Amino acid sequence: DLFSVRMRAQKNGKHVSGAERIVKKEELETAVKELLNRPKEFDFMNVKVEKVKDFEVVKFNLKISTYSFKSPEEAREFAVKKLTQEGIKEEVAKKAVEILSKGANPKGGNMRGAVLMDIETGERLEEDKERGVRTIHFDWKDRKKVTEKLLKEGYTLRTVDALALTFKNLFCGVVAELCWSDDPDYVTGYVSGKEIGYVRITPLKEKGDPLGGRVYFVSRKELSEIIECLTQKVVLIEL
């Protein structure tokens, strides 16, 4: 019996922490304990525990590579460069970067989810452009093991999380992703696809800049299934 544990937390009506864990009955309390402890400070927290009906185990198989640069301009060019290796018009890849660096949310600032960009046109396919689409119901099959492995290999807790998220995106039919954090002090971002793997790029933004985001490069003809997979398919990723 598998359970999805989803936590969100707020201070003063602004989102401050979030996570999901998908575990067996025997590890259910451990997981709740982790997520309860997760935010340093909050005034409202919600935890949601849901029994999993169908799910699928998938084997992780992306090559990881890191790349460093003098400035964000150089970083963002390499991002575009690498995206074209997935068959994306340079104009489209450039459009994603522009969107992210300007603030993906039309109101201003950060979306809570991702832009769904049409690979051919560059058009924003998502209906709510403030909220975007959120990739949920996924986790490492054995997170203890993955976490110790990836940390002493050099990578960070963000990497651990971002790896699992993207892998699900790519599995769900997303052709490629552009992403960088919105935390103003973490300036390593990435670009990923089945061909290029997971490609870490520092620095993808200036230090102290609080804007970040995700763009999923999707084929329009597949939009529905992709949105369905992203939001609903339960996926456990195995190393």
Ligand X SMILES: Nc1ncnc2c1ncn2[C@@H]1O[C@H](COP(=O)(O)CP(=O)(O)OP(=O)(O)O)[C@@H](O)[C@H]1O
Ligand Y SMILES: O=C(O)CCCCCC(=O)O
Contacting positions for ligand Y (CB under 6 A)? 155-156, 158-159, 162, 179-181, 186, 188-190, 200
- Vertex 195 angle, CA 161 and 148, to 5°: 30
Number of residues that bind ligand X (CB under 6 A): 15
Q: Is 63 exposed, middle or buried (0-12, 13-18, 19+ CB in 10 A)?
A: exposed
Give the residue, chosen from 110, 159, 188, 192, that forms a contact with ligand X under the rule CB under 6 A: 110
Output 80 or 111, the one with its CB closest to ligand X. Answer: 111
Residues 147 and 133: their CA atoms lie apart, in Å, by 26
Q: Is 213 in the site for ligand X (CB under 6 A)?
A: yes
Output 173 or 184, the one with its CB closest to ligand Y. Answer: 184
Tell me the closest approach of the beta carbon of residue 44 to ligand X, in angstroms: 14
Output 3 or 186, the one with its CB closest to ligand Y. Answer: 186
DSSP H helix total and E strand total for the chain: 6, 12
Tell me the closest approach of the beta carbon of residue 207 to ligand X, in angstroms: 15
Close Cβ partners of 233 (under 8 Å, ≥ 6 residues apart): 56, 137, 172
Output 80 or 204, the one with its CB closest to ligand X. Answer: 204
The b-or-e profile of 107-141 (16+ CB within 10 A means b, else e) is: eeebbbbbbbbbbeebebbbeeeeebbebbbbbbb
What is the maximum alpha-carbon separation in the chain?
A: 50
Token look-up 């340093």 returns: 40
Tell me the closest approach of the beta carbon of residue 1 to ligand Y, in angstroms: 31
What residues numbered 169-188 form the site for Mg ion, per CB under 5 A? 183
Output 24 or 207, the one with its CB closest to ligand Y. Answer: 207
User: Which of the choices Mg ion, ligand X, ligand Y, none does residue 220 contact, using the CB cut-off of 5 to 8 A by kind?
Assistant: none
Residues that bind Mg ion (CB under 5 A): 183
